[PDB]
């Protein structure tokens, strides 16, 4: 509760950490590659659960 | 144009006239605004009437009217006991 | 090796083949067996096949 | 075992007929046995309907099927069996997912950019993931190079469900059939506005069979399908869709910029399968859940997909 | 029915004959039974000239067939019919992806001739097969082949106007379906392009004696620069240059279909192979 955020550079709506690996701006990417972040970054992902 | 929306409330009457002035006093400032009342039957901003009576604990289930291709969602108030009333003005 | 100003959140996803565990209660679901009926496949000219 | 081997043994080619030559009395029970063959495979009885079943392996050919993997969502769970599904090409070597799309994901594909809509965007809601699954629409149609990318499966015959990563199988050549082995017939399901007739059209030699064109065409305002129904040939409906396609060689015409490639074509006919002439397209009705939408009922379908050939 | 065609092999093939027979065992190749004129190898022979449209001629008229099995005195195979399908594979060493095409066209290779044979020391013949690839890449090395030899034999003639590094930067290279693919660009090639070259010659006189035939609407499409010919000519003439354009405008139409087209439905890539029926 001290603090919004341990880096501002991927937890934020359009960051750095976010547009390498969020599915919404990776679409010009090779869609076999496995991607563990997007566990933690896509969206739907994150928010299907 | 004239509006038909219909409340439901727990309360009186002379509740319902006041809590109903509060709810359009927006409408009233847009009306005088948007036009303005020259003569003086403009001035009456609607009118409410109750239409009956129903149990506030089960009341108001929503439900769909389906008809031929498409179904507006609709409201299904269960045991209803319809006793009108003459209008009630709201200014 | 000298630091570029920013550190590296590095993550990785790591597999394990685990030995499972299942506990299926009594009566718990109702299998219901129908019966085996035969086809025909491509029944060429050294075999038949169903 | 028993039930398996009652269900083999009736299941089983018959033997084939020998005629010992060499021998005297072999040879004069064999033909016996072959005219009472012939006496009880040809005479009205129910012999000679019994015959028919065995099949004797030229007539009958099991079809080819495609197994596609696709994802749920651009897919719908509650659209009919016969539906002519459209695979698109993928740029990616390694994708995985092939791209599909009945006819009314694809008509929301159409329209959106710009009945048959009611029951399409009743079936297919959010267009903006269908946009998403096609890396180019505009400017793809814009070179009109839309055609070739877009080629047929056939119709569904088995639908698999699975709520990520469906599963769909299509005869994508041969008799148009379920997987099934209870069996049942794979009806053709077309919507009724974009199917016509061009017998219709057209307002004497009876042929084999009717056959199924797609014509994927490059209308002014977006894309346009169209399935065409005719007992002609291929190289003969080209002709006859020259003559349908009147006021585009006008159009063509007043575009006179003869450097700009893009409306010197106008979409492509690609034959889709073969049904037989004798019992026409019935027509149907397909309810989903609040609408219903008139749709072409095509049985007896016989699927063999053509080139998209440019008119 | 019964399919399996035996070829007659005079001498015993020995081991890398095997090898080698193996290594395209899923490929297709037509049929004239003699083991001389077995496949495309009596145009690919070093008898004639390898003259293109002959050879098409030849892919066009005789059967297809795809072989099963090898031996050391037998070579199984199955010619092809219009009712029933094969499993073939991709076995060239021009290696073109059948990913997801419906169609498969048969062409002659004109990717060299050592790069889809089998040189047979020990027989009589040394054995070619034709190219079978995906009918937009047939098209594409076509057009690539097709304005190279016009592209080169201009500038065989006359270097001023164009570049070779110019076309050989665009007209070597295909890319179909994220595919890169180079193109081995040596003669060959020389009769169609010069079919091609009288084709587009002659065709001014001759879209102006269509359009004389039956009156601006069809006059206001060519542009200037494509409408200006003299009204003087003689009557043989015309009719001898219509005639022979029309003749090698109907040669090059059947020719630029490809042929023997084939069609596909499940390609496994992981296996190489896909059902392929005769369309």
């Not at chain 1, 990776?26 to 496995?34: C, D």
């Not at chain 3, 100003?5 to 009594?26: C, Y």
């Not at chain 4, 088995?158 to 990520?164: A, Q």
């Amino acid at each position: 509760e001290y603090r919004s955020t341990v880096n501002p550079w991927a937890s934020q709506l359009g960051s750095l950490g976010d547009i390498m690996y969020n599915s919404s701006y990776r679409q010009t990417a090779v869609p076999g590659l496995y991607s563990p972040c997007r566990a933690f970054f896509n969206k739907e992902e994150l928010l299907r659960n | 144009g004239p509006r038909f929306t219909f409340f439901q409330s727990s309360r009186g009457h002379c509740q319902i006239m006041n809590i109903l002035r509060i709810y359009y006093s927006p409408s009233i400032m847009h009306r005088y605004a948007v036009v303005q009342p020259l003569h003086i039957e403009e001035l009456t901003f609607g009118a409410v009437a109750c239409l009956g009576t129903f149990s506030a604990t089960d009341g108001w289930r929503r439900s769909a009217f389906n008809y031929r291709g498409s179904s507006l969602p609709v409201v299904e108030i269960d045991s209803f006991y319809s006793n009108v009333s003459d209008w009630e003005v709201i200014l | 090796k000298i630091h570029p100003g920013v550190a590296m959140t590095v993550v990785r996803t790591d597999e394990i083949l685990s030995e499972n565990i299942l506990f299926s209660s009594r009566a718990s679901t109702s299998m219901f067996i129908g019966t085996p009926n035969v086809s025909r496949r491509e029944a060429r000219v050294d075999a038949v096949t169903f | 075992r028993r039930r398996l081997q009652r269900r083999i043994a009736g299941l089983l080619p018959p033997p084939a007929r020998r005629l010992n030559i060499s021998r005297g009395s072999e040879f004069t029970r064999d033909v016996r046995g072959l005219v009472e063959e012939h006496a009880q495979a040809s005479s009205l009885s129910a012999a000679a309907v019994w015959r028919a079943g065995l099949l004797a392996p030229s007539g009958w050919r099991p079809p080819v099927f495609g197994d596609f993997l696709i994802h749920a969502s651009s897919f719908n769970n509650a659209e009919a069996t016969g539906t002519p599904l459209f695979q698109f090409k993928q740029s990616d070597p390694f994708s995985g997912v092939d791209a599909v799309f009945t006819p009314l994901s694809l008509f929301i594909l159409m329209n959106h950019g710009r009945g048959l809509t009611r029951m399409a965007n009743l079936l297919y809601d959010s267009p903006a993931t269908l946009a998403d699954l096609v890396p180019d629409f505009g400017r793809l149609v814009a070179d009109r190079r839309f055609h070739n990318f877009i080629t047929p499966v056939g119709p569904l015959v088995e639908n698999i469900k699975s709520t990520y990563l469906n599963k769909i199988t299509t005869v994508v050549h041969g008799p148009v059939v379920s997987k099934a082995i209870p069996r049942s017939t794979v009806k053709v399901t077309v919507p009724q506005e974009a199917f016509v007739d061009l017998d219709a059209w057209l307002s004497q030699p009876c042929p084999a069979d009717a056959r199924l064109y797609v014509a994927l065409t490059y209308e002014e305002a977006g894309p346009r399908f169209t399935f065409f129904q005719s007992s002609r040939g291929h190289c003969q409906i080209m002709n006859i869709l020259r003559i349908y396609y009147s006021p585009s060689i006008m159009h063509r015409y007043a575009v006179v910029q003869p450097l700009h490639i893009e409306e010197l074509t106008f979409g492509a006919v690609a034959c889709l399968g073969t049904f037989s002439a004798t019992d026409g397209w019935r027509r149907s009705a397909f309810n989903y859940r609040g609408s219903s939408l008139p749709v072409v009922e095509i049985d007896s379908f016989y699927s063999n997909v053509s080139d998209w050939e440019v008119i | 029915m019964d399919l399996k065609v035996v070829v007659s092999l005079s001498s015993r093939l020995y081991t890398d004959e095997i090898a080698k027979m193996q290594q395209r065992i899923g490929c297709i190749l037509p049929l004239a039974q003699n083991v001389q004129g077995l496949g495309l190898g009596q145009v690919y022979s070093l008898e004639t000239v390898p003259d293109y449209v002959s050879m098409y001629n030849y892919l066009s008229d005789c059967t297809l067939a795809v072989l099963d099995e090898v031996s050391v005195d037998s070579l199984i195979l199955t010619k092809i019919v219009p009712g029933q399908t094969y499993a073939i594979k991709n076995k060239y060493q021009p290696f073109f992806q059948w990913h997801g095409t419906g169609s498969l066209s048969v062409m002659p290779p004109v990717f060299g001739r050592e790069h889809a044979t089998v040189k047979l020391e020990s027989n009589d013949v040394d054995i070619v097969f034709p190219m079978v690839l995906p009918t937009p890449i047939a098209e594409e090395v076509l057009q690539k082949i097709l304005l190279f030899n016009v592209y080169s034999r201009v500038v065989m003639q006359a270097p001023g106007n164009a570049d070779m590094l110019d076309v050989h930067m665009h007209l070597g290279s295909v890319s179909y379906l994220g595919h890169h693919y180079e193109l081995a660009l040596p003669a060959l090639l020389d009769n169609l392009s010069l079919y091609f070259c009288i084709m587009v010659t002659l065709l001014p006189r001759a879209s102006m004696r269509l359009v004389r035939g039956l009156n601006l609407f069809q006059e206001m499409v060519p542009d200037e620069i494509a409408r200006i010919d003299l009204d003087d000519l003689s009557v043989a003439d015309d009719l001898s240059r219509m005639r022979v354009m029309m003749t090698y405008l109907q040669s090059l139409a059947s020719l630029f279909n490809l042929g023997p087209r084939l069609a596909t439905a499940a390609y496994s890539q992981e296996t190489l192979t896909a059902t392929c029926w005769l369309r």
